[model samples]
Target: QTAPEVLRQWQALAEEVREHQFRYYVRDAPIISDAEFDELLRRLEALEEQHPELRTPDSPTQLVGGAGFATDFEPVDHLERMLSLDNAFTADELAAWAGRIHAEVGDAAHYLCELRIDGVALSLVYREGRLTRASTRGDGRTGEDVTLNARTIADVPERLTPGDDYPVPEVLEVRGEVFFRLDDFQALNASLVEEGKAPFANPRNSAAGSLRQKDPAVTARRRLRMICHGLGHVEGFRPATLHQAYLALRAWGLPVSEHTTLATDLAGVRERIDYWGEHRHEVDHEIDGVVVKVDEVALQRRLGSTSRAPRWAIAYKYPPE
Candidate 1:
């Protein structure tokens, strides 16, 4: 293709693909099937590869794993930086992550394994036992404020417990996945189709689109749920281990992933990962991988982090279906 012609084609493809994505990810409505969407994406990638000059920062292919949209969302600075996890594709890669942990601390390592929920990362803030703010994981350091939308999630407690075993923190930032239960997602798509609207492609996109809505009523109707698996900033109580923190969160009436186990060694870690890989279909939520984290908070601190991810945690991604 001529250079100008290629550029125009690329731009056209990018716009179309992004529009499809917006329909799928922000509107909970997709006009194309998964295969059709994949074909479109593949063609765009091929074009971009053939004509490198046609690629731009905002190209659809370039944003394969990029953050989801929140164009009108107000920016909110994260109390603690929210970073992405390094992915492990195979059993060997999972072992490599554990090996690095052994090399770093020289201590007997215990890992906590939790289902890596396939959804948008959300950061929620609570002040004096009441939810004050909620934000998307925009660019890690800062995010878009969506407190009104967050309040609509039944799993997101409006207030923390003052009478719980763990003292309620004066200020707390709970981080986790905001996702659609698989059944709920399917039902939602059915309802949309019945209403002569486009159905969502998948659960993750449905949850993301629903959570990013400008109207809280729209969010409320989506029946979104949350499972807090991490903490960001806290003022009152400090958890000693990853497991302990989650236990405390559960006691405080916050939803935590029910499928978590503590494994004492790499062998145990591998066992859990393997078990989940086989049994993931039994879970209600859409899980893409297993997140293994060093159990000890202090050791996690000692091991430190890279610019992108903490050294103490790794996500062992399942083979694509």
Candidate 2:
């Protein structure tokens, strides 16, 4: 296709596919078949191949990793190495976690409740509100940098737009999960099956695979999405509460998850946790449990981190498999 033709096709296909995603995910009705959706993807790829200059950072085709690591995951002695949350397998363990946070921060502190999405852990850095780095969660201290590929996630904003209500951070490290929905996972595997390729073990693994593809084109096809869970390193105006920070991120045009809520106490948090666990399938994303944290930002700072976890935060897990 000519450059103009390619741009025209690109715009047309992107609009259609995005509309399809809304219908399927938001409205619970699919307007197009999987094959038709895949074909539009194919056409966009072909056009992008010939007119690479036309590829915008915001393009739907930029979400996947463009190349594999030349070396293994690089050890980044982080300003704060993003730590893993301690897990709980039963109601008793979950209650214990709540007890600990309450002991440290107090019983009356508001809690930030968010879904623990079942997907590959990812860290993305934005310098001047634009994506500058993307990495896998490799042993907390190390990770594979995949910035080239992460640009394509339709749900992830490549650049944050500061609105009248919020100030932009000079630099921010947003951590979240990258994954396909169960339905999307099945659809991808179905295509793989037809092509005689081995199906992915699960959506999490598929997400991990998509982020490590050597070609950006391959990653672009996955249509993976992201949901911001927490921050890594942040500067400029800091938000006062986890709930406010989440709202700030949304105002800045980042893809913050809709699952976050401000709970006034443990009981309120438990209600949200119960609701999410039972209704995870109702959402497009899969979540393993709920992460309940002390909502007050100052308290989180005061609580601090150990060698392992942030004293201010604790993950209240659902029953394990």
Candidate 3:
């Protein structure tokens, strides 16, 4: 009943049950079916019967019913602050954001435009190309330690590949998001209905719900996809432009978007914004808005940040869905 392999699987099962419990209670976005959740709970108990030692006092098995779920994960801080994007609800506000960039760097301040999907943000830390941790953006300074759940995301590379084009940084903390693919989101909703729970409201809630699970394997079972963007921190590897680093991240096997475009002026930025607004639905996931960023990383360094958001990046959000 207890080998190293089964032990690992059993551990994952117990962890994920709590993960599911955590999602249902604290996060308010449970993704797994109650039947599926129960199935895992049965296995957790079965293993607990055999290897009583594995059934530690803090084990999720001992903490049955999930109503009293306590987070097994500790809170972790990012190396550099994880920056949140400031919102420009109106296009005029978008132009004003561009105006501030012009004030900082005159011309030459090309903008990197990409779609902002409605999902939860994640930060993955890779040390010398080896995957170390994955965290959710809590308050920008700190995030919930979701490393175990992140391990289940197939999109997340366990190690960054050493590339001919780009060197694997001693430490590369790349930011990305975990989301339910549209069809998958529907399927999960169907899954919940079959499992005797109401369907999740939207993609963002479900995404965060899945990411915060007590178990890694529960997250593994969800058909969630992740796309990396922006910078969190890097050592022994830095690029001239934010886009360059994005390219490097892509080369290193992190999932990222190809729709990111560059613009030199407010007119071009506005066009890019409107372009996505028209074509947003065509993408696989839910698009909330367009993100415009300072193309040059140095200029990003130049403008810096306030207590909340970086001045270099602004999001032109579409009306709420």
Candidate 4:
């Protein structure tokens, strides 16, 4: 029997993506650029999403690398690195980090200080102003697909809404975290234990289990919330600051933390960090740390990045309460 037209297309796409990955990651050379690769990936993913029967263990969408990987979940690459931040356990380390930032960019004009919720991070990509795919952090560059599960979360938007200030983007990627509220965590754990299933140890782990369900219906049964934290790759529009990106995301119907505040100096940052540490129990989710980010997007560029984390942002750990 002859295969269908889409099946043959999948065969070629699987090969092309594999070849592109080898050239881009291992060979120290890239044949097609990000735009081209993104488009190629878009097509392949669209096909599989439309005809999921085409997905298989050997499919390019199910391979292991920077591009994609094989497993129960399909894999996708982050348009930009999903990035991490240096952590500071004490005031002294935080001060030292501020000194380093000052040495690079003279001084941080503003800091985006906010509570760091303990949760599972996700990378979301939108194309033609709609949520096309979502993934969990695997290796910063590669992530496992969780689009169907993410769609179940009320906080995540199905499609982006463009306001007068920011038009719809051809492509956009954002990084965010999801968590269970303190009360919700307790409720779910109690129910699971009574139902004879293994109980999740914490809120974040419960959030992860909620998001990793093989059946989206199981995920829908759980109460999971999200807040977009980082602006990743973009096309058609650019945000001047990370906070501005959050505003745009909020305006686009994506949930962003309303509690994020601006700090004018290291002292202000430290003050807010202390404030949040004291009020951590008052928040819905567990807040064990605070994140301080250079508010100016341009200044963040000047501050630069390391192999793993960007120098422009640091997390101040507040020890377990």
* Clash pairs, model 4 backbone: 62-69, 62-70, 63-68, 63-69
Ordered from best to worst TM-score, the candidate numbers read: 3, 4, 1, 2
Candidate 3 TM-score, true structure as reference: 0.77
Candidate 4 lDDT over 106-141, as tens digits, reads: 764699998898899988899888888889999888
TM-score of every model versus the real structure: 0.76, 0.74, 0.77, 0.77
True lDDT of residue 114, candidate 3: 89
Global lDDT scores for all candidate models? 0.83, 0.75, 0.81, 0.82
Error of 4 at 20 (Å): 34
lDDT of 2 by residue, 110-224 (tens): 8888888889888988888877778887778777767656766777776789788888888888888888988899999998999999999888888888777654445767778
Query: Per-candidate RMSD vs. true structure?
Result: 17.0, 9.5, 8.0, 11.0
* Per-residue lDDT of 35 in model 2: 79
lDDT of 1 by residue, 57-126 (tens): 6666675533344435899999988998999998778878777888779766688888988898999998
Q: Model 3 misses residue 136 by how many Å?
A: 0.9
Sliding window of 10 residues with minimal summed lDDT for model 4: 62-71
- Ranked by lDDT from best down, the candidates are 1, 4, 3, 2
Best by lDDT: 1
Report the Cα lDDT for candidate 3: 0.81
Worst 10 residues of 2 by lDDT: 64-73
